[PDB]
Design an enzyme around this catalytic site. Structure first.
Site, PDB file in Angstrom:
ATOM      1  N   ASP C  40       0.810  -1.213   0.000  1.00 45.14           N
ATOM      2  CA  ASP C  40       0.000   0.000   0.000  1.00 45.14           C
ATOM      3  C   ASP C  40       0.848   1.271   0.000  1.00 45.14           C
ATOM      4  O   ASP C  40       0.653   2.152   0.843  1.00 45.14           O
ATOM      5  CB  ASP C  40      -0.953  -0.009   1.197  1.00 45.14           C
ATOM      6  CG  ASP C  40      -2.258   0.709   0.906  1.00 45.14           C
ATOM      7  OD1 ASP C  40      -2.343   1.396  -0.134  1.00 45.14           O
ATOM      8  OD2 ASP C  40      -3.206   0.569   1.707  1.00 45.14           O
ATOM      9  N   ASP C  91      -2.282 -11.086   7.312  1.00 46.78           N
ATOM     10  CA  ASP C  91      -1.864  -9.699   7.438  1.00 46.78           C
ATOM     11  C   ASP C  91      -0.359  -9.618   7.618  1.00 46.78           C
ATOM     12  O   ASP C  91       0.285 -10.578   8.039  1.00 46.78           O
ATOM     13  CB  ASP C  91      -2.534  -9.018   8.639  1.00 46.78           C
ATOM     14  CG  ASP C  91      -3.820  -8.307   8.290  1.00 46.78           C
ATOM     15  OD1 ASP C  91      -4.084  -8.117   7.090  1.00 46.78           O
ATOM     16  OD2 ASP C  91      -4.544  -7.889   9.218  1.00 46.78           O
ATOM     17  N   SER C  92       0.201  -8.449   7.291  1.00 47.14           N
ATOM     18  CA  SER C  92       1.651  -8.330   7.152  1.00 47.14           C
ATOM     19  C   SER C  92       2.364  -8.547   8.478  1.00 47.14           C
ATOM     20  O   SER C  92       3.552  -8.885   8.490  1.00 47.14           O
ATOM     21  CB  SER C  92       2.010  -6.955   6.589  1.00 47.14           C
ATOM     22  OG  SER C  92       1.622  -5.922   7.481  1.00 47.14           O
ATOM     23  N   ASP C  93       1.659  -8.357   9.593  1.00 49.07           N
ATOM     24  CA  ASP C  93       2.239  -8.513  10.917  1.00 49.07           C
ATOM     25  C   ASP C  93       1.869  -9.851  11.532  1.00 49.07           C
ATOM     26  O   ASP C  93       2.180 -10.095  12.701  1.00 49.07           O
ATOM     27  CB  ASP C  93       1.791  -7.368  11.835  1.00 49.07           C
ATOM     28  CG  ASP C  93       0.280  -7.320  12.023  1.00 49.07           C
ATOM     29  OD1 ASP C  93      -0.449  -7.365  11.009  1.00 49.07           O
ATOM     30  OD2 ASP C  93      -0.178  -7.241  13.183  1.00 49.07           O
ATOM     31  N   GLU C 177     -14.727  -3.026   7.003  1.00 49.53           N
ATOM     32  CA  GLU C 177     -14.940  -3.461   5.626  1.00 49.53           C
ATOM     33  C   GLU C 177     -14.847  -4.977   5.465  1.00 49.53           C
ATOM     34  O   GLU C 177     -15.500  -5.541   4.580  1.00 49.53           O
ATOM     35  CB  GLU C 177     -13.942  -2.760   4.697  1.00 49.53           C
ATOM     36  CG  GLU C 177     -12.489  -3.234   4.797  1.00 49.53           C
ATOM     37  CD  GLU C 177     -11.781  -2.749   6.053  1.00 49.53           C
ATOM     38  OE1 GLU C 177     -12.183  -1.700   6.599  1.00 49.53           O
ATOM     39  OE2 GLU C 177     -10.811  -3.408   6.485  1.00 49.53           O
ATOM     40  N   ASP C 178     -14.051  -5.657   6.292  1.00 49.66           N
ATOM     41  CA  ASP C 178     -13.938  -7.108   6.167  1.00 49.66           C
ATOM     42  C   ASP C 178     -15.184  -7.857   6.636  1.00 49.66           C
ATOM     43  O   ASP C 178     -15.378  -9.011   6.243  1.00 49.66           O
ATOM     44  CB  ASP C 178     -12.717  -7.603   6.937  1.00 49.66           C
ATOM     45  CG  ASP C 178     -12.714  -7.152   8.380  1.00 49.66           C
ATOM     46  OD1 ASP C 178     -13.420  -6.177   8.708  1.00 49.66           O
ATOM     47  OD2 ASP C 178     -11.996  -7.779   9.185  1.00 49.66           O
TER      48      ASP C 178
END
Lengths: 558, 558, 558
Positions: C40, C91-93, C177-178
């Site tokens: 992003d 997720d990235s983490d 939103e998810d």
């Protein structure tokens, strides 16, 4: 002269000597007072014992042609014969003190009294009320005092006050004829005085004529030379007394149902003589009796009293300690009827429990339909405590506050206010007790020891400065700084309260050492001392090793 | 003649003499009353006893051809033979007062009564009711009096009232044939009087014939010459007495199951005669029974009576002291249904507290939906006392009456009645306890020492004489006149109860001298002696100087 | 390719190697999955670290022209690129288990899932729903499982399910939103499964957008291809969770007042898409909140939330455990709105009484408007005991159970379970107590000695096996089999519990012989040893002749 003793006599041979002596033992000049004794045609040696005091007392004996049937006429015939500056009506069964005329004559020359009230003392169990003889006031009226709560002629009146304004005893009305004589004096006296330095006076039918006298009093108040606002307030406190302490109080309960039509009618004309504007000033629980008296509706009147004794009403709802009662299907709604008043009639405590007795004087609701609990509210309105009713009799509720039950809750706060909770269904009333009570039976700052977690506290009952209400002070102390322990003799342990007093539970006691214990009897000698009468002698070197100290229900380790 | 004593005898050889003496000892002229004796064919010498009263009484002797089976037929045969103005049905086993006829004629001559009810009094334990004979009334009806609660023929009827209406005892029905007689005479009477100035009367199978009489009563009520509203009310009060006192009260709980269909059919035709509009005036708890009586359903009728005994219901809810019960799955809802049975199962008391166990044997409500309180009401109903519930188990309610909490309220009166308050929301029930109880484990007049303001009183639990109900008696005593303090051996103080036994709390006890105390134990030896086994010995000269004597939680000043 | 792993990154340089290693470490053939990273527009060196793995993985690497502010647009860009049969969002983490893809592949081939939940695990203090991961399940629905309680996209979805039904993350709504994305998958899925064999997934502004997403979910549920009753039920579960755990919970208490109108407007539009018939399906306490949300009325909405939180209601009653609440004047009554939590904060006992404290930690009604009693209930429910409240401090309720009061009732059963009964008018709660408590103050099986009709018993508190609740076990014992009595020195008697400890009340005690008694002081030296320090010596020959042993309030005949 100064005084004029009027004595109504009728068949008083066996006790006129007790009165003729009091007048002879009078510490007063014989030339400045007289005794006017008019007889109501007796049938015994009554005048023959009075004539044994003709040389010891200035005497005016008279006897009626026939009997009247009451002290009314004998006092009137004697009132015309009285030539002194003042009069004192004394029944033949009563007596007075040796300094009655002395203290009264001085009190007259200093305040110039028209009607003087001397404090009465009751012998052989005679009342004789007291609500107006607690102080000595050189001037009172019917509003700022309680003179309207006593209407007997056993007082001191000015002769010109009763002769100029035409004040004589109603001879034809033999029922409570004295209540009109005093009220006429009260309304016409420019200054009413109450004397209460010692004990001076020592006391021993068809409802037609009774309710007529009451109507005469209501008329005399409305036509007196007073302010209109003051006329109804004086008439209100008179109705506050009549409907509470006279024979009217509950006649529909006791009087035969055949004679109640005779009562409600005679009572009806009395209340009809009172304006309907006065109903707002009389006590709120009497207004339903005032409406049904004017309407002369005895059936609806008998129900109002029966709704009070048993506390059952046809329809009602509560609006802040005051109800709105409908005594029958169709009757109007009396509003503003009475928070219930609370008076602390007893207060005892120690290091074991707290025994209080709260009495509900003015609670219109009948007992049994409402639940009460004793509330111990903190000052910061965070913590509270509710102690249930231990036992009650009529409207006297006694609570047993056991310390062991509330020991683990007191350290939450230091100021614990004592409220009384009243609940009727869902309406909870919070009355702060303390300002109305009896005399505190202890000395100020008298606390009680409380042991909790190897630490010592004191629960100090006290009254707040704002509204004189009672609270409980819970703070930590040090034992050796508050109570000293000494060895009196060889089998007594004295606990002397240094800064304050400490009460304890009397009865059996026990002290403990490392390898021996001695039984004793604890007893409160004074308010800051306590004696422990031991069973065997304790040596003074053993007195230094007192490990634990118990009572009949509480323990304290050293 | 004025009276015609009708006497149905049958094998009365052993007790007819008492009646024939009471009929001769009358303070009445001999020519005003006759004794019409009709024997029901005796087997012994009953008639030979009657004949020996023909010279003292105007006697009428007869005897049926065979035994009829009761006083039914002999009472009608004597009614045709009776020529006096009034009749008097007196059984062959009972007898009347000396002034019966004398006070009856004078009362009839003063009010012209058609049915006179003399006050009945039972001997050797015989009821004989009492509700309607509390007063001497010149005129009473079947709705402002309890005359319907006595249908026995032992009354004074007008010969014209019975004959001119064909009022005779039904012969073919042996069960309760005397209730249709008095109800026929009650409705047809223009005036009914009740004479209770003194004691006048001294009284000593298939249900097809039973409920048939009850049927003729209901029809007789609906066909009377009164208002339609008064018909349904007289019919209702009859149902209020029948279903409460006769054999219908709980027949499904007693009658064998093989015979209950026979009962539900006979009782049905009696209830089918009562219109369903009359059920609104019957007591609410009987409306379920009146419903299943018309439907003659015995399985649902038994369900109602069992529900009333144990308090279980299929589905119910409480709406202001009245419950809405559905007894089975699929039945209509009976709404607005409305005292518990109490038995004192235990009672212990001493100089410390009181323990009593009141058990609810039958209540129409499950536990947890009502509050209970123990009531100690005064005899004059002026004072009262309420003890909170100490503990309970199912329906066994136990109370702890701490004497220390109630000592300040006893000397108000001397007699205290023990009631039992049971409040359902707001409706209260005040049940008098004491009559139903277990065996009183104490001897009569066993009291308990009480100390208050250096005075000595006694709490004497007793049972009243009228209804065997328990109560407490508070009065003063002299300690040295009811209790003696002696020295057994050297370490025992023997407390002896003279005029009555005194109970005390067993346990620790101490005696106190001026400068020495003694620990001891307390064990009730007998009911009137108490042993104080001390810790150490005490000399005889020191036993004379016992200043104070305590128990486990109470003190006593000597 | 079995799997496409979709990873949105944003300044993930400090933690991205953990995930990449976990993808490289997969026990799964590299040819059968790809990793699609869309960044992003990071401003650090995220992309360069990601590139280090392009040989270990089949890697697609993209980057948006500008930061979207959330994972929505990145994941959509990746999903359009995915060619896997299935996709997995990490997720990235976060990072995943090395056996994730292997296990999921096998599960999918056995069951053909369209959506596959995989058990999550929180690290470093994070959660992570668990309640739906207690079991492995091949097929679940929104109504028979807890899957509706996890809506993050950290799951495995069939790519064709998503693309054929146009299921993408909303990019223009940045809040929740998810939730819309995963709801859409559930509703279109032919089979939903949960794989819980091990921990697979390791997890490390205005409300217009928030409530817009919620309204779309309502529309989505109501439009699904499911039965009408099922749509309503699924929606009810979503509302249950949303108001209990989302930012909606308590918003009128936390958000600045100036902004609450804006919240209730976006929330109101959400609830207005929910037909009112659904309110009946939601937890009752939420029903008033739904009503005022639809009307967009924040003042009444805020009163409701404040009333719940402080326990005060404008007008209310309770019917069978549920409240009927009117929250403000003039508002509708809400009916049937839903037990208090109870903790036993104290429990002490001896042979004389039991003292227990119960604290109501959570309760929807303030102190004073309810009553509480302690209930002892036999295991067979046949017998019951109720102990009145002794005192209460706020919501701390203390009960003194005097064993002398309950001695007569204990023998009926052996096991007595402790309940707290709470009555509000007529709605009664029975709360079983013991499972929440402070540390029990005694050794297990510690008992109290009871003496009853010449027989000895023990009362033994204990805790049940199934739910750890407290009960009282009452059974007979043989004193000489359970407790030894020996002489220590000459003035100390030691009672030792042989099989269990026996606790006695400390304080005064005595031993009684046939002609002597000795006082003492009882102290509990340990939990199974009691010392009575006598006031004098006792010879060994007389110690064998002790007939009776007394404590401060109890007696035991030996």
């Amino acid at each position: 002269m100064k005084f004029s003793v009027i004595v109504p006599t009728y068949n008083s041979e066996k006790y006129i000597t007790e009165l003729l002596n009091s007048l002879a033992k009078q510490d007063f000049p014989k030339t400045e007072f007289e005794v006017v004794v008019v007889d109501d045609c007796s049938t015994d040696q009554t005048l023959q014992i009075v004539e044994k005091y003709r040389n010891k007392l200035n005497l005016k004996v008279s006897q009626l042609e026939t009997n009247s049937g009451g002290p009314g006429k004998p006092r009137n015939v004697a009132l015309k014969q009285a030539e002194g500056e003042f009069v004192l009506f004394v029944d033949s069964d009563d007596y007075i003190n040796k300094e009655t005329l002395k203290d009264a004559a001085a009190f007259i020359d200093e305040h110039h009294s028209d009607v003087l009230l001397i404090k009465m003392k009751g012998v052989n169990g005679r009342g004789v009320p007291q609500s107006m003889f607690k102080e000595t006031a050189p001037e009172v009226t019917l509003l700022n005092s309680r003179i309207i709560y006593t209407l007997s002629p056993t007082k001191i009146y000015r002769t010109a006050l009763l002769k100029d304004n035409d004040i004589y005893f109603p001879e034809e009305l033999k029922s409570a004829e004295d209540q009109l004589f005093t009220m006429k004096a009260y309304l016409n006296a420019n200054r009413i005085s109450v004397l209460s330095d010692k004990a001076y006076y020592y006391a021993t039918v068809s409802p037609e004529d009774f309710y007529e006298v009451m109507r005469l009093i209501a008329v005399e108040i409305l036509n007196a030379d007073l302010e209109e606002a003051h006329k109804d307030q004086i008439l209100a406190e008179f109705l506050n007394r009549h409907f509470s302490f006279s024979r009217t109080n509950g006649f529909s309960l006791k009087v035969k149902l055949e004679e109640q039509p005779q009562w409600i009618n005679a009572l009806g004309d009395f209340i009809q003589a009172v304006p309907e504007r006065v109903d707002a000033l009389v006590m709120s629980k009497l207004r339903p009796l005032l409406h049904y008296a004017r309407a002369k509706d005895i059936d609806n009147y008998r129900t109002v009293e029966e709704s009070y004794r048993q506390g059952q009403y046809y329809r009602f709802d509560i609006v802040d300690g005051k109800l709105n009662i409908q005594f029958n299907e169709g009757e109007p709604y009396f509003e503003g009827i009475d928070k219930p008043k609370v008076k602390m009639t007893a207060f005892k405590f120690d290091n074991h429990k707290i025994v209080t007795e709260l009495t509900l004087n003015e609670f219109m609701i009948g007992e049994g339909h409402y639940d009460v609990r004793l509330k111990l509210h903190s000052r910061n309105k965070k913590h509270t405590m509710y102690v249930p009713l231990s036992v009650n009799a009529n409207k006297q509720y006694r609570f047993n506050i056991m310390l062991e039950d509330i020991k683990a809750y007191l350290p939450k706060e230091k100021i614990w206010d004592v409220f009384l909770e009243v609940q009727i269904g869902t309406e909870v009333f919070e009355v702060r007790v303390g300002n109305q009570r009896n005399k505190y039976a202890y000395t100020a700052e008298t606390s009680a020891l409380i042991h909790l977690n190897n630490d010592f506290y004191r629960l100090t009952p006290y009254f707040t400065k704002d509204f004189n209400n009672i609270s409980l002070y819970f703070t930590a102390i040090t034992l050796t700084d508050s109570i000293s322990m000494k060895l009196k003799g060889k089998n007594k342990i004295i606990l002397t309260g240094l800064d304050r007093g400490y009460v304890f539970e009397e009865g059996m006691a026990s002290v403990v050492l490392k390898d021996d214990m001695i039984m004793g009897m604890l007893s409160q000698t004074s308010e800051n001392e306590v004696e422990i009468l031991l069973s065997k002698d304790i040596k003074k070197r053993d007195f230094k090793n007192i490990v634990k100290l118990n009572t009949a229900h509480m323990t304290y380790s050293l």
